[PDB]
Design a protein around this ligand. Sequence first.
Ligand SMILES: C[C@@H]1O[C@@H](O[C@@H]2[C@@H](O[C@H]3O[C@H](CO)[C@H](O)[C@H](O)[C@H]3O)[C@@H](O)[C@@H](CO)O[C@@H]2O)[C@@H](O)[C@H](O)[C@@H]1O
Ligand SMILES: C[C@@H]1O[C@@H](O[C@@H]2[C@@H](O[C@H]3O[C@H](CO)[C@H](O)[C@H](O)[C@H]3O)[C@@H](O)[C@@H](CO)O[C@@H]2O)[C@@H](O)[C@H](O)[C@@H]1O
Ligand SMILES: C[C@@H]1O[C@@H](O[C@@H]2[C@@H](O[C@H]3O[C@H](CO)[C@H](O)[C@H](O)[C@H]3O)[C@@H](O)[C@@H](CO)O[C@H]2O)[C@@H](O)[C@H](O)[C@@H]1O
Ligand SMILES: C[C@@H]1O[C@@H](O[C@@H]2[C@@H](O[C@H]3O[C@H](CO)[C@H](O)[C@H](O)[C@H]3O)[C@@H](O)[C@@H](CO)O[C@H]2O)[C@@H](O)[C@H](O)[C@@H]1O
Ligand SMILES: C[C@@H]1O[C@@H](O[C@@H]2[C@@H](O[C@H]3O[C@H](CO)[C@H](O)[C@H](O)[C@H]3O)[C@@H](O)[C@@H](CO)O[C@H]2O)[C@@H](O)[C@H](O)[C@@H]1O
Ligand SMILES: C[C@@H]1O[C@@H](O[C@@H]2[C@@H](O[C@H]3O[C@H](CO)[C@H](O)[C@H](O)[C@H]3O)[C@@H](O)[C@@H](CO)O[C@H]2O)[C@@H](O)[C@H](O)[C@@H]1O
Ligand SMILES: [Ca+2]
Ligand SMILES: [Ca+2]
Ligand SMILES: [Ca+2]
Ligand SMILES: [Ca+2]
Ligand code: NA
Ligand code: NA
Ligand SMILES: [Zn+2]
Ligand SMILES: [Zn+2]
Ligand SMILES: [Zn+2]
Ligand SMILES: [Zn+2]
Ligand SMILES: [Zn+2]
Ligand SMILES: [Zn+2]
Ligand SMILES: [Zn+2]
Ligand SMILES: [Zn+2]
Ligand SMILES: [Zn+2]
Ligand SMILES: [Zn+2]
Lengths: 292, 292
Amino acid sequence: SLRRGIYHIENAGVPSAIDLKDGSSSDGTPIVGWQFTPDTINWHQLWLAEPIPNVADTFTLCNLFSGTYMDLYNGSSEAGTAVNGWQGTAFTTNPHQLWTIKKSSDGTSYKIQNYGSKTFVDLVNGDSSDGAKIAGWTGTWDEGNPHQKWYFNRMSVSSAEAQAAIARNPHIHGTYRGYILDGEYLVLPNATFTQIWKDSGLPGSKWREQIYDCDDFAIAMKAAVGKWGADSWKANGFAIFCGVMLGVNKAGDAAHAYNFTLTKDHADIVFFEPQNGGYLNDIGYDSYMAFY
Amino acid sequence: SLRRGIYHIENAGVPSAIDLKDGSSSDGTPIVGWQFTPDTINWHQLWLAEPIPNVADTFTLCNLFSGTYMDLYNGSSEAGTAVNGWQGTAFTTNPHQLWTIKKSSDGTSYKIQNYGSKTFVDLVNGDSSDGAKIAGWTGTWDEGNPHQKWYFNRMSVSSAEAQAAIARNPHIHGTYRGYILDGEYLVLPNATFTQIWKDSGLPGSKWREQIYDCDDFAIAMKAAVGKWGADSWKANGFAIFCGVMLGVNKAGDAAHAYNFTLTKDHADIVFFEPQNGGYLNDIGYDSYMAFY
Ligand SMILES: C[C@@H]1O[C@@H](O[C@@H]2[C@@H](O[C@H]3O[C@H](CO)[C@H](O)[C@H](O)[C@H]3O)[C@@H](O)[C@@H](CO)O[C@@H]2O)[C@@H](O)[C@H](O)[C@@H]1O
Ligand SMILES: C[C@@H]1O[C@@H](O[C@@H]2[C@@H](O[C@H]3O[C@H](CO)[C@H](O)[C@H](O)[C@H]3O)[C@@H](O)[C@@H](CO)O[C@@H]2O)[C@@H](O)[C@H](O)[C@@H]1O
Ligand SMILES: C[C@@H]1O[C@@H](O[C@@H]2[C@@H](O[C@H]3O[C@H](CO)[C@H](O)[C@H](O)[C@H]3O)[C@@H](O)[C@@H](CO)O[C@H]2O)[C@@H](O)[C@H](O)[C@@H]1O
Ligand SMILES: C[C@@H]1O[C@@H](O[C@@H]2[C@@H](O[C@H]3O[C@H](CO)[C@H](O)[C@H](O)[C@H]3O)[C@@H](O)[C@@H](CO)O[C@H]2O)[C@@H](O)[C@H](O)[C@@H]1O
Ligand SMILES: C[C@@H]1O[C@@H](O[C@@H]2[C@@H](O[C@H]3O[C@H](CO)[C@H](O)[C@H](O)[C@H]3O)[C@@H](O)[C@@H](CO)O[C@H]2O)[C@@H](O)[C@H](O)[C@@H]1O
Ligand SMILES: C[C@@H]1O[C@@H](O[C@@H]2[C@@H](O[C@H]3O[C@H](CO)[C@H](O)[C@H](O)[C@H]3O)[C@@H](O)[C@@H](CO)O[C@H]2O)[C@@H](O)[C@H](O)[C@@H]1O
Ligand SMILES: [Ca+2]
Ligand SMILES: [Ca+2]
Ligand SMILES: [Ca+2]
Ligand SMILES: [Ca+2]
Ligand code: NA
Ligand code: NA
Ligand SMILES: [Zn+2]
Ligand SMILES: [Zn+2]
Ligand SMILES: [Zn+2]
Ligand SMILES: [Zn+2]
Ligand SMILES: [Zn+2]
Ligand SMILES: [Zn+2]
Ligand SMILES: [Zn+2]
Ligand SMILES: [Zn+2]
Ligand SMILES: [Zn+2]
Ligand SMILES: [Zn+2]
């Protein structure tokens, strides 16, 4: 089963991702194929898959930027029916906006079937051009046709996944406690994480004993990523990943506050030093507390 | 013994506090008597008393706003010698800037004696006028003379005092852990705490599921008080008091993030709701975590 989370949805045939054109909130905004840059935020190309209760393998897909939903126009079963952004809700009963998403015959990519029409999301003609039509189209669950096959490239972690990544780290103190704030987090590329650090003005902040020392940098960095999340995205029902940790050194006579993010592969954490913007596999402290 | 911390220093004879005139960082800025408003920040009238090691009952007094030090001009023992703000350091050996501070004969107020001159800080003529001279003056440790007697009205708590105030609260969960970030905190009047909440723009923030929900409000409020502290005060070696808590309800099926401050008398905590700016003795959750 596809898990609740944020996905970059990439065609199995050509390197085109599902793109809400200009990220418009306008009803009837075309959803198209568009080229993408890896290890960035692809601003118009992120989709929040919300599972529907009591309806197997079926979801809403909410554009993270627009807060509008993938919508089969008038729910038509006609081949070539437009797939657009449209206003909706996370648990709608509008079958225009309900998508059964299951593994293709290749066992890695998925097919996206409209719950109402039973037609499939199709990159018409396998066109790799920026702005290529995406439509609802006849097809089957089993066929190889790559026009209708999509890699769901997972951009988020559950809190349980974030907890596993921390637990895998060697720099966790024996007294560690971890405090979970949210359920599902968008993992940032380091490029973006760094940019939010710059845009916060933390690079200009001077260390001052107690009045602006390591706890103040680490908590400011988390607030800045919180603020960036609300101000950047119109969808709800997720957070941005940015941890705070308190750590103790080896001698056990010095504590230090810092941040942490997650690796590309979501498997491990990386320490961030909000006083200089360094990423470290070893920040010279072992964490006895985290909140994220 | 006077404890390390921040004091509003008020004359025992008349309601004049020790005031660095216009809060100037200029060397030779006059220190004067000036009327004050209770339960505000008295911006020019707060002094950080730093104890000197191996020198009994002797301190630097750093103006919290200017970051400059109370200084007996040329360390003269002549009656009427000017007491000014001057550049210095927290553990100077400059005896112009070193002050032996011990209880008066009334056992509540203190006398302030220059370590070098052995003359006392004196509100000349007990003049209650705004801008009245304060000078180094002959006198004794035992005499009643209220010109040379000063209430040290304590505005800060140790981390140990903040810990005692939390532990006295009935709304602490059995699983509570508390994480201490700093050593000495300026306690804010609710008026100021509220104003920092307004100036943050949190009153305009909408609750949004995960993306800006209670953890985001509470952490934003703490960052805003951190920022206000650094941006407002030129002294170092203290923090501003603003706690985060995570709490669980009575049913044990709902968690909520919020802030907490301290009472006037420093003895108890009060819960703050950063989504509406309410102060509450009972926020309907019991804290299982705090950092402050
Ligand atoms: C290259 C082409 O692939 C298949 O064609 C696709 C179309 O496939 C889908 O629709 C057709 C009917 O037109 C049929 O229902 C099929 O089962 C289904 O997968 C469709 O993807 C369009 C739009 O992108 O492009 C191609 O026409 C196949 O039917 C053709 O024989 C041929 O191999
Ligand atoms: C009202 C006045 O109080 C005492 O006088 C103070 C001064 O007191 C201090 O200085 C005097 C010498 O001038 C003396 O050394 C005394 O022990 C010491 O406390 C001083 O505070 C000035 C400046 O504010 O005001 C008064 O003159 C006392 O000596 C007087 O007899 C008289 O009772
Ligand atoms: C917000 C906007 O993002 C970029 O433009 C998008 C564009 O982005 C994708 O395609 C570009 C090349 O056109 C790159 O491969 C990016 O990595 C992709 O994310 C598309 O989403 C189109 C169609 O909706 O909209 C554009 O606004 C970027 O080029 C802009 O500078 C800007 O940051
Ligand atoms: C059968 C039809 O279903 C709904 O209309 C859809 C429409 O639905 C969404 O957008 C409208 C506003 O246009 C409302 O906000 C709905 O709540 C949304 O779910 C879209 O799906 C478009 C494009 O496919 O098709 C319409 O038919 C409903 O609003 C109508 O009243 C009607 O019952
Ligand atoms: C920063 C400044 O603070 C206030 O003015 C100070 C003044 O403040 C004290 O005296 C006033 C009345 O003059 C009130 O009692 C305040 O409660 C006191 O804190 C003094 O510190 C003088 C001498 O250095 O400087 C003034 O700037 C306030 O009146 C101003 O509006 C302003 O906020
Ligand atoms: C004996 C004298 O002590 C110092 O000068 C003081 C002066 O000290 C402070 O300010 C100066 C700059 O004027 C330096 O930063 C010192 O480090 C500070 O401690 C003030 O206390 C004034 C006013 O009472 O008196 C001067 O005599 C020292 O700097 C001199 O060299 C000299 O040794
Ligand atoms: Ca939350
Ligand atoms: Ca601090
Ligand atoms: Ca600290
Ligand atoms: Ca949140
Ligand atoms: Na389901
Ligand atoms: Na001492
Ligand atoms: Zn319909
Ligand atoms: Zn093709
Ligand atoms: Zn380690
Ligand atoms: Zn540190
Ligand atoms: Zn190491
Ligand atoms: Zn001297
Ligand atoms: Zn008098
Ligand atoms: Zn309770
Ligand atoms: Zn809440
Ligand atoms: Zn209650």
